[PDB]
Symmetry: none
């Protein structure tokens, strides 16, 4: 059931709903989840890797990133997994940290 | 036990001193039936330390790897799914992962 819940929560994230590419990615990714080749954390990473729409900020400050990670450690399961997967976009694609915090806050609320 | 023999023959296993050491510690529990082969793979590969890494790898290639993995033979699929955890969690290079999978497929 919670396997379904996590999927429903993911689909409910504003970030997911503003990125049709993420919805398209989930369609192709989810079978491997149902077939148990990958876990939900992996689904989140794959799906978010397909995102195209989000604010960008290059060379973001270290202190804020460290505070983001300290806060991430305290999150509930789904929220923590969402946070870690979105942080991959912060470091690798310059996704704005403030935006990442909004997504994480939304995930925590859904959970 | 074939799966254990094949695991010991994988280049990725042999080139990772931590994996070889891990199997020594883990296998008794496998022989005593406390854990299955999939768990042996998870415990052993989780100890891996050496492998090429690449951040934010492209989804299309990821999906191709997974579609191939789904059609694999038992040992190869088990190995591939375990290695894929390293692809996503530690950035192990997908091309390297495909190499390991091909070796496993040949051994089996």
């Amino acid at each position: 059931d919670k396997n379904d819940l996590y999927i429903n929560w993911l689909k409910s994230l504003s970030f997911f709903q503003t990125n049709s590419s993420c919805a398209e990615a989930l369609v192709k990714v989810i079978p491997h989840y149902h077939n148990k080749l990958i876990d939900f954390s992996q689904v989140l990473q794959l799906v978010f890797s397909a995102s195209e729409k989000f604010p960008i900020q290059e060379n973001q400050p270290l202190p804020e990133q460290l505070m983001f990670l300290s806060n991430l450690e305290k999150q509930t399961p789904f929220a923590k997994a969402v946070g870690s997967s979105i942080y991959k976009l912060v470091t690798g694609k310059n996704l704005s940290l403030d935006f990442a915090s909004q997504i994480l806050k939304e995930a925590s609320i859904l959970e």
